[PDB]
């Protein structure tokens, strides 16, 4: 009784320290209000707002349906480890929430 949030297992942070991975979910026809949060930056994707993490400059996100292509930039080595993606579908009521097993982001 929750949505099937799918992260990738281990993620290899990039040259300048920018990790990118897709966070997919399964009952994904509730697309109007869709807040996505990152736990070890968060934004709410609607129609008025289409590229998120405006208030979280270290993060980049592009929504389409059952996949969210994600980007955390500026990651140090002192940050490596467990990264989690939470998919809230605030509309229609009633909410329909989910969380993923996490991502080991190893910041070489």
């Amino acid at each position, epitope marked *: *009784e*929750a949505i099937q949030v799918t992260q990738p297992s281990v993620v290899l942070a990039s040259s300048h320290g920018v990790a990118s991975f897709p966070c997919e979910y399964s*009952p994904s*026809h*509730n697309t*109007d*209000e869709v807040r996505v949060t990152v736990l070890r930056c968060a934004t*709410t994707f*609607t*129609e*008025k*707002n289409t590229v998120g993490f405006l208030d979280y400059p270290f993060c980049s996100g592009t929504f389409n349906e059952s996949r969210v292509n994600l980007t955390i930039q500026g990651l140090r080595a002192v940050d490596t480890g467990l990264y989690l993606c939470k998919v809230e579908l*605030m*509309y*229609p*009521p*009633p*909410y*329909f929430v989910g969380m993923g097993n996490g991502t080991q982001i190893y910041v070489i």
Partner: antibody
Amino acid sequence: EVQLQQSGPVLVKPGASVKMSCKASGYTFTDYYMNWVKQSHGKSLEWIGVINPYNGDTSYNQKFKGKATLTVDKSSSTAYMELNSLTSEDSAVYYCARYYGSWFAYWGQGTLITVST
Amino acid sequence: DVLMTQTPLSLPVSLGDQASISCRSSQSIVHSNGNTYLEWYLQKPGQSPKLLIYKVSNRFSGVPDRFSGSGSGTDFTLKISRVEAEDLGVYYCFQGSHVPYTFGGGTKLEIKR
């Protein structure tokens, strides 16, 4: 394509209870939410509530919170609404209708509940 | 609770003219996410309702191009341009923004021949 099949008409004596069905076909019953809409003989429509079949969550129209109890059953692709303390003003046409970018985008043919002595 | 009051209640219109219905909401219909959730349903006689316009001005698949929505805040308008015999019935606006979700009273569109 999508088809919603509701139970037939039920004559229930007052004070009893009735539970009706909506049998989803041509789509994935758990994928989209589901509403029940009441249409008295006085023509105008009313929203009772919505239930997430994948889950069982509901959001109810506070003025129905006690009169109606909506419930789903994933193995049958069938939703259920149940009405306690059936009165005379509880007699209406009851509709199931499934979300799709819009609240009532697919409609059931309707269950006519007559509450007589 | 948000009241939806339509006008007219009856509305005779000859095939080929332009019918136009008005829905007025007690309080704004714009939701917090920024979307605005007005819907236009048409109940042909002895049929269940059928969806016509969602999110104010959007035509659900199948609805002819004669049908159109417009509005913002507390005032909205469905307008059939060039009416046809197939269009007779009752036309309901419905808001799905604020709980509880309510309907308008309806607008019986009659044909004149």
